[PDB]
Design a protein around this ligand. Structure first.
Ligand SMILES: CN(C)Cc1ccccc1Sc1ccc(O)cc1O
Ligand SMILES: CN(C)Cc1ccccc1Sc1ccc(O)cc1O
Ligand SMILES: [Mg+2]
Lengths: 210, 210
């Protein structure tokens, strides 16, 4: 079963703004997704402080960056707290309606798109570079699910019978045809060093067979 | 009953660093505390999206800044999710052990104290300006508690029979004798505009009788 949901009007508006506004500084999408991963890792760490069994689904707390030039995908994997099905449907665990409001009011007051993460909706900066985003997630309290959207007002949720993850979130960015620089090792390294050099979890940039 | 707890060695180390390092840019303490309040407000908002009764303890989501020159206190009040007794004992709901580690490693790599909030331990920047901090908190799942510390390696927790808060957190900064500029209306306004101008909750700066 694939279930299809409509985005709330404000989130649809946010994604259309991200897709259609001319804005050259697209590289901040990776900082925002790594920041979300770090937040998710913080959350499972915090829960584990009083219930160590929370880590039975995986003790390692890390972020992996996986480019694939054949599929034209960049995948960000974390072993953080993950998302339940209900979290996925609630705009990926965000307060996206109120966050979008505050982001829009800030843009009116002289903010720019790079400040999106201050308003809790940094995930949607993925659409600066991706035509489609697939999110695979596993939370301790639910089964493994796949969320997907190519924007256009709707997203799908289905149970994921793919590779079991144990716990965490994978964001698969199906890149736009003119955004393949974000598959290049030196480009990813540059962005991580520029924007994410002090993240408190190991970030491993995977290599590809040439 | 007043219970006294020792800080973990790493947190005690962090507070001693904050208290003893020469660092003139102390004003960032307010940005960090407002940011924590905004995070707590985001959390109760998110919970309320699927269980509206979470707001039975108070529908208003806001931040108040209350200077008191007679007591020499600056109080930051929020109606966010609040903290249970267990949260208070776990370093105010932070991952302070791992966060302190990452903050220290960043300081070695060219970070400065103003970046403390990136590592989840921004609360402790309160000790840039306060000799003592009192935290009154009420979470939906627990009773109202008061946490207190003048650093020096220990903190206390007691049930609070003061004014019932409903839900949220009050951080009371008992300011150092040479830090009373942070009670001045124009100074607080300047800092809020400089560092917190896009927070998505109303921030109300209370006035005093002269
Ligand atoms: C809402 N929670 C239950 C989970 C959660 C909380 C904070 C941050 C991330 C997350 S999950 C996640 C979402 C987006 C992403 O890009 C990476 C992630 O790890
Ligand atoms: C751990 N949670 C259960 C609560 C919580 C989560 C995130 C941020 C703040 C908080 S509570 C709080 C702590 C410090 C402060 O300065 C202001 C606050 O509102
Ligand atoms: Mg944050």
């Amino acid at each position: 079963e694939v279930e299809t949901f409509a985005f709330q009007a404000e989130i649809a508006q946010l994604m259309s703004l991200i897709i259609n506004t001319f804005y050259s500084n697209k590289e901040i999408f990776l900082r925002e997704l790594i920041s979300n991963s770090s937040d998710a890792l913080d959350k499972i760490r915090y829960e584990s402080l009083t219930d160590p069994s929370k880590l039975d689904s995986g003790k390692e707390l890390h972020i992996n960056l996986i480019p694939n030039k054949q599929d034209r995908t960049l995948t960000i994997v974390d072993t953080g707290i993950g998302m339940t099905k209900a979290d996925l449907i609630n705009n990926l665990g965000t307060i996206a309606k109120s966050g979008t409001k505050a982001f829009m009011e800030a843009l009116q007051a002289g903010a720019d798109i790079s400040m999106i993460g201050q308003f809790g909706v940094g995930f949607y900066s993925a659409y600066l570079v991706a035509e489609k985003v697939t999110v695979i997630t596993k939370h301790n309290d639910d089964e493994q699910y796949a969320w997907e959207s190519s924007a256009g007002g709707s997203f799908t949720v289905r149970t994921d019978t793919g590779e079991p993850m144990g716990r965490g979130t994978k964001v698969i960015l199906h890149l736009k045809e003119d955004q393949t620089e974000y598959l290049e090792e030196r480009r990813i390294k540059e962005i991580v060093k520029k924007h994410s050099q002090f993240i408190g979890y190991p970030i491993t940039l995977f290599v590809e067979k040439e």
